[PDB]
Design a protein around this ligand. Structure first.
Ligand SMILES: [Ca+2]
Ligand SMILES: [Sm+3]
Ligand SMILES: [Sm+3]
Lengths: 133, 140
């Protein structure tokens, strides 16, 4: 989706620096994301990252006048929601939705946002969509 | 001044930290059983010591590389004020209960719960001008 709202690890790196290391974030991970082509999982991953981030957002209080966790997350919530929009709109050869109920697991902030960056980077370099078994 | 040397907590930073900590995050603290109804001389030494231990350990959970708002930075300052207190306890020749035998049982607390116990404990260095004029250290 050409326009990705630039979600570089710039703010992500800061967020991870300020989230406790032993704090587990829940994410319904789409299995196969580490081997299958993107058109097979990007749609559901983007939807799940959106729900996890939004739920994570309610766990912090505002003070957006100095790059607080709340503010950065809100910024990431918006980026992913728009990617969700695109995916539903620019569907073809892409598994536009279907199912949407993988298995929920726990991730460290580091692991969670690594999954977050790969999902977004997935759009960056993505042209050859279409099988997924 | 009562042990008020660099003894200004300033909750301005504390609220900001609680706000920057997930309400979901559980913090460990060896809590003294009834410090909520017992005279301060019954728990203050042990608690000031456990608070320090808990805050010091949280340091490990954050990164010291962050511009502007930094949770590592705020915790560091909090550790110093509480470590300054563990000093007014050292030389302390006052006998009231400044010991607590061993170490209490560990308990989990959310950020708001933990820092409430924190501020109270600190503030306890003002409302502690007695010992023989207070109650026992048991509840029953
Ligand atoms: Ca949800
Ligand atoms: Sm000192
Ligand atoms: Sm009693």
């Amino acid at each position: 989706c050409r326009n990705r709202v630039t979600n570089n690890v710039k703010d992500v790196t800061k967020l991870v620096a300020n989230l406790p290391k032993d704090y587990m974030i829940t994410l319904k991970y789409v299995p196969g994301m580490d081997v299958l082509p993107s058109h097979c999982w990007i749609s559901e991953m983007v939807v799940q990252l959106s729900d996890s981030l939004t739920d994570l957002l309610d766990k912090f209080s505002n003070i957006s006048e100095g790059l607080s966790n709340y503010s950065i997350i809100d910024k990431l919530v918006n980026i992913v929601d728009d990617l969700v929009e695109c995916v539903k709109e620019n569907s073809s050869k892409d598994l536009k939705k279907s199912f949407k109920s993988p298995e929920p697991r726990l991730f460290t902030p580091e692991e969670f946002f690594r999954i977050f960056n790969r999902s977004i980077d997935a759009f960056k370099d993505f042209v050859v969509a279409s099988d997924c078994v």
